[PDB]
From a paper:
Thrombospondin type-1 repeats (TSRs) are small protein motifs containing six conserved cysteines forming three disulfide bonds that can be modified with an O-linked fucose. Protein O-fucosyltransferase 2 (POFUT2) catalyzes the addition of O-fucose to TSRs containing the appropriate consensus sequence, and the O-fucose modification can be elongated to a Glucose-Fucose disaccharide with the addition of glucose by β3-glucosyltransferase (B3GLCT). In addition, POFUT2 is localized to the endoplasmic reticulum (ER) and only modifies folded TSRs, stabilizing their structures. Here, we conducted molecular dynamics (MD) simulations and provide crystallographic and NMR evidence that the Glucose-Fucose disaccharide interacts with specific amino acids in the TSR3 domain in thrombospondin-1 that are within proximity to the O-fucosylation modification site resulting in protection of a nearby disulfide bond.
To identify additional interactions of the fucose with other amino acids, we crystallized the O-fucosylated form of TSRs 1-3 from human TSP1 and solved the structure at 2.6 Å. Interestingly, we observed a continuous electron density between the fucose from TSR2 and the two cysteines (Cys451 and Cys489) that form the C2-C6 disulfide bond near the O-fucose site. This electron density suggested a stabilizing hydrophobic interaction between the O-fucose atoms and the disulfide bond. The electron density between the O-fucose and disulfide bond from TSR3 was not continuous but the same hydrophobic interaction between the disulfide bridge and the O-fucose moiety was kept. In both cases, the hydroxyl groups of the fucose on TSR2 and TSR3 were pointing away from the disulfide bond and exposed to the solvent, allowing the more hydrophobic face of the O-fucose to interact with the C2-C6 disulfide bond. Interestingly, the O-fucose residues in the previously published structure also covered the C2-C6 disulfide bonds, but the fucose was flipped. Although our MD simulation used the previously described crystal structure as the template, the orientation of the fucose moiety in both TSRs was the same as in Figure 1B, suggesting that the conformation of the fucose moiety in our crystal structure adopts the most stable orientation and is likely a more reliable conformation. Using MD simulations, X-ray crystallography, and NMR, we showed that the O-fucose covers the C2-C6 disulfide bond of TSR3, protecting it from reduction. The orientation of the O-fucose is mediated by interactions with the side chains of several underlying amino acids.
Author numbering: 434 to 547
Write the structure that this text describes.
C-alpha cells in the first residue's frame, strides 16, 4: 500500500541554553506504513529549525606574565615582581573571573656581597 506520514512531533526545547542552537520535530511513515508494492512517503522525516539566544558567558583567561622586574639589589638578597591581566580573554556575558594572583614576587641576587 501507499506510504502515509504521521502528524509531526512537538518541537524539542532549544538544543542550547545560550548562543545559536536548533529545535527538532519528527514524523514516521507509519500512517500507514508502506506495507508492500507501494510508493514511499514524500519528503524528509525530520525538521531542524534554528533557535538563537543571548551570548554564552566568556570566562576570563590570563594573558602572559610580564618579564620580571630587575632585582631590587645586585647582591645580598632582593625582590622582583611580575604581573598579568585577566583579558586573554576578558570575562564577558557574566563569564567567571580569572583564578589566581595578578602578581608574583621572588628573591633574586641572594649571593653574599663582596
Ligand atoms: C545553559 O545555560 C546558559 C545560560 C549557559 O549557562 C550555558 O553555558 C548552559 O549551556
Ligand atoms: C651591584 O653589584 C654587586 C656585586 C655590588 O657591586 C652592589 O653594591 C652593586 O650595586
Amino acid at each position: 500500500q501507499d506510504g502515509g506520514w504521521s502528524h509531526w512531533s512537538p518541537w524539542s526545547s532549544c538544543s542550547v541554553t545560550c548562543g545559536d542552537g536548533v529545535i527538532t520535530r519528527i514524523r514516521l511513515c507509519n500512517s500507514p506504513s508502506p506495507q508492500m508494492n507501494g510508493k514511499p512517503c514524500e519528503g524528509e522525516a525530520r525538521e531542524t529549525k534554528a533557535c538563537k539566544k543571548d551570548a554564552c558567558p566568556i570566562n576570563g583567561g590570563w594573558g602572559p606574565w610580564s618579564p620580571w622586574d630587575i632585582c631590587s639589589v645586585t647582591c645580598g638578597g632582593g625582590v622582583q615582581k611580575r604581573s598579568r591581566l585577566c583579558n586573554n580573554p576578558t570575562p564577558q556575558f557574566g563569564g567567571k573571573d580569572c583564578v589566581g594572583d595578578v602578581t608574583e614576587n621572588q628573591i633574586c641576587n641572594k649571593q653574599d656581597c663582596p
